[PDB]
């Protein structure tokens, strides 16, 4: 017999929400990284 509780359901829901938000943040970070090319960073370093 399986015992499930509303606390388990809320836990899973909040876990899913937090994972989604963190995935969004990670995608933002990846896009920001790709936004500024490494060669442009080297160019700025060379100018400095």
């Amino acid at each position: 017999h399986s015992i499930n509780l509303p606390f388990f359901e809320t836990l899973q829901e909040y876990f899913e929400r937090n994972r989604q938000t963190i995935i969004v943040v990670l995608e933002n970070v990846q896009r920001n990284l790709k936004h500024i090319n490494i060669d442009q960073f080297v160019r700025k370093y060379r100018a400095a």
């Binding site: 899973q12 876990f15 995935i23 990670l26």
Partner: protein, 48 residues
């Protein structure tokens, strides 16, 4: 990995790996492991 992760699936994967490790340990053979150790010692000696 963040997208892959899920609490129920995470615990399921951990239990799977633990069962695999238990099966490996219970079937552990000291002669085979000793030969593997000799192989690794020979590898380290050959490397250095």
């Amino acid at each position: 990995k963040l997208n892959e992760l899920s609490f129920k699936t995470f615990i399921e994967d951990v239990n799977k790996f633990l069962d695999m490790l238990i099966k490996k340990l219970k079937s552990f053979d000291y002669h085979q492991f000793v030969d593997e150790t000799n192989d690794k010692i020979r590898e380290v000696t050959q490397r250095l």
